[PDB]
DNA sequence: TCACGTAAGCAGTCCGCG
DNA sequence: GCGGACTGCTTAC
């Protein structure tokens, strides 16, 4: 069988690698890797190594990775380029596995674990590990078993063994209702004391060493707590056993808010699922706790319980253990749907990197490009330092705030990667420059043609047409791979066999990699950073969008015989929005039998008339810029309008990036019932309260489908009833940054943000109460305004999102929450923006 | 929120300033 | 009042 690596590390002059051999067995080996770097040489010095610019290079074989690292220093001292992959472990992977890696995931030990710690005096800080670990559930992907470690005796009480029979009982039987598909997969291990529990866990850890270590908040809590707790009791020599190479290190994470403290376990790849979720899910959630996410993803959260979790083990040890098992399983269910782990394994093995590097698109792309270049015996350039500088981005047209009855939309296919491929943009394909005219001249095709020999961008860059660049070459491959999976996602959407969400992630998360490459060219840490290339992409995007805007207006003017009219109402980056009122009027709205009739008509007109006109409109631009390959593909997206015969307005814009459409068709998907397409509005902002999002969305639905009278009817009913709503559902949400920065003596300091003020108000209310939930820096909070004269002392209070507010102050908050201010700022004010733009009244006049 | 990007809207604070 | 400069936060693409 083909060999593939599991983990790889660099410790001194040795490479530590865990891998699967040809027999399918997991092996470990330490290799004295002798790396090689490159330096430019005279042409007379024959070689097979050249850089990306065709300049000859000499291969320097070093006795060890130390000599190679020191050589880079000397070359820097001299001031000459030191070419080659300076990340020696990546080069080792490239040499060891010089072929496309086809891995077997069943041989990869993926570990999903979570722990429980009873703490009567606040959150148990992993740096201290003051309190005993009384529960550990450890799922092993190879064994397909849930190994449960249960502490029976601790200074916080002695308990009886957990019952698997009771845990299997339904909730209405007093049981825990632990899923039947995992109850037979539970391995229960009771322990008389903590030392025995931890000792056995390490023996368990060494026998089944995790390759992929995951869970929820395992990196910031579970891993450092276990490491420190074992350290305090047995010493670091025993805590080092958590690594298969017996080597760890305390890693400090830097950001714009302070430093962090995690533990690096060499030989292990940690993929904390909360980090995998935040990056790959394409959602911004009010709360990122496991219970909130499980509710969103699975319509079911963690196991519910009574009283604080600090007293759960003593009061209901049965539930306490079952709660712990379910926590681990919830992550396995979320992953079975999201497939973020399998995505990471795909990306990591495709790029030939450490699996945990999938968090970094830069490192990922650097190794893809390196391996690609090495294949042709080409040598990558040395990374350089650059000052952070801004550069132009996409174009956004200022829409006229108004209702728009009939709307048809068109969008380009993966614009930026396509631009890269079409123009042939790459660090080595640069050919020169041309004198630039104002951009509006290229849009109107009145400026002189840039070149008859090179592929050009309206930013002034010229690229070779007859040679390949590594960047267009490698981005094409990943683009094509997504296209193959996208051919499966649209199926399930139209058929809705199944496949969708996973087939969605398969395609949508692949695009995150290909979209990040264009951005990478504008990041100073990318090896192939170049603002000329990065601007060439975005400027081309600006041109193409407004070029096709002009072309669509021209085509629709001559076809409708109207002259000079504006059909394109709005555009953003890769899309355009066309008013279809005039098209409908040509046939006559009375000549349509029903809603589907005019939808079928606009669909036929878009495909047979507009689309071929659009493609012709792009082929000439391709000729104008003398591009290498025509790839500006813009096809029909949405078809929107009110129901036939109704009083709905179909859609509306309030401004840039803010609009609502009543869509009947999306590409190949024809909706049985009209779907709302709402972008940018408060219904989409996670900072808007849950019950307000729903109410606003219903206000919008009535505007687009039913009209003014229905909207006013619903508004009047919502204002009369909204006080009944649960306080959490009407609470605002916001991320909490730099709390201490605006903290002066527990009271709001200068320029204190409104939500931060709510946090300080909360901190005073719970001050002295060591068991009360603490607002964490960098996390999110629920926010409620407070009526004047409230006992809390300020205009608002804020508490951790995704949770009920503590029973200490809950009754007071309910009594003093300002329903009026809440209604005006979150509901009425945005609704005023929607209706005034749509020329509608949410309240009666005369 | 730990070396993909820019564009751009709304909430709120504090400032000249008339 | 009231408008702009600014921070903070959010989304679209
Ligand atoms: N092409 C390339 N090689 C690199 C780079 N960085 C380090 N190397 C190193 C990796 C390799 O150590 C060396 C050249 O590897 P090969 O010519 O592809 N195969 P050969 O039969 O010559 O192998 P050996 O040298 O063991 O005889 O340059 C890089 O960026 N590019
Ligand atoms: N750097 C960067 N640019 C982006 C990102 N998202 C969008 N852009 C810019 C670059 C993109 O070229 C452009 C549009 O990106 P899509 O909305 O994803 N449209 P596509 O046709 O690719 O996906 P589908 O086939 O599913 O419709 O916006 C991003 O996360 N990063
Ligand atoms: Ca698209
Ligand atoms: Na696109």
Numbering used by the authors: 1 to 496, 546 to 895
Quote what the paper states about this structure.
The gp43 DNA polymerase of the RB69 bacteriophage (RB69 Pol) bears primary responsibility for the faithful and efficient replication of the viral genome. RB69 Pol belongs to the B-class of DNA polymerases and is closely related to T4 phage DNA polymerase. RB69 DNA Pol synthetizes DNA with high accuracy, introducing one mutation per 2 x 108 replicated bases. This high fidelity is achieved through the combined action of its polymerase (Pol) and 3′-5′-exonuclease (Exo) activities, which enable stringent selection of the correct incoming nucleotide and excision of the mismatches resulting from misincorporations.
Therefore, we took advantage of the Y567A substitution that has been shown to improve crystal quality without affecting the catalytic parameters of the enzyme (and references therein). We obtained crystals of a complex of the mutant polymerase, DNA and the dGpnpp non-hydrolyzable analog that diffracted to 2.30 Å resolution (ternary complex I). As expected, the ternary complex structure reveals an assembled active site with dGpnpp occupying the incoming dNTP binding pocket. Strikingly, however, while the base and sugar of the incoming nucleotide are found in positions that are consistent with other RB69 polymerase structures, both molecules in the ASU present an altered conformation for the three phosphate groups. As a consequence the α-phosphate is not properly aligned for catalysis. Furthermore, the D714A substitution drastically affects the metal coordination. Neither the dNTP binding metal, nor the catalytic metal ions are found in their expected positions. Interestingly, this aberrant active site conformation correlates with similar changes to those observed in the apo crystal structure, suggesting that the altered position of the incoming nucleotide is related to the conformation of D411 and, in turn, to the missing D714 side chain. As seen in the apo mutant structure, the D411 is flipped away from the active site and this correlates with the repositioning of the E686 and E716 side chains. Thus, the absence of the D714 side chain seems to cause the movement of the key metal-ligating D411 residue in the polymerase pocket and, as such, agrees with the observed decrease in the DNA polymerization rate.
